[PDB]
């Protein structure tokens, strides 16, 4: 099983979700669709009326300690941390917390 974490900004606080995939893994587009569904449901749970959407994605690179643009599925290694930027959002750097399980939010 491959574990990918995906984080984003929610009204100034960082929210982190973990997704578990088969040993093969996700493709970037699939990971983005799952993330969009999960964070829209999260926003609804928290009482936020605006929709969640991704306009840019990055993935943390362990070897260089930098955030790389997320473009290819080969970038999605085990225990990867993804960050999703949103439109119409003031994104101030803050600590990314331990993840919740993302699967209950997939509906």
């Amino acid at each position: 099983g491959i574990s990918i974490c995906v984080a984003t900004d929610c009204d100034g606080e960082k929210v982190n979700l973990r997704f578990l995939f088969d040993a093969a893994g996700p493709s970037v587009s699939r990971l983005l669709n799952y993330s969009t569904t999960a964070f829209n449901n999260y926003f609804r749970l928290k009482g936020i009326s605006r929709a969640f959407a991704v306009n840019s994605a990055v993935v943390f690179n362990d070897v260089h300690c930098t955030w790389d643009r997320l473009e290819r599925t080969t970038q999605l290694l085990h225990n990867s941390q993804v960050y999703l930027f949103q439109p119409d959002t003031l994104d101030i750097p803050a600590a990314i917390p331990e993840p919740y399980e993302g699967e209950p939010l997939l509906s």
């Binding site: 960082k14 943390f60 960050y83 101030i92 750097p93 803050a94 600590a95 990314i96």
Partner: peptide, 7 residues
């Protein structure tokens, strides 16, 4: 551990 990135 990780701080979120800036665009």
């Amino acid at each position: 551990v990780l701080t979120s990135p800036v665009p």
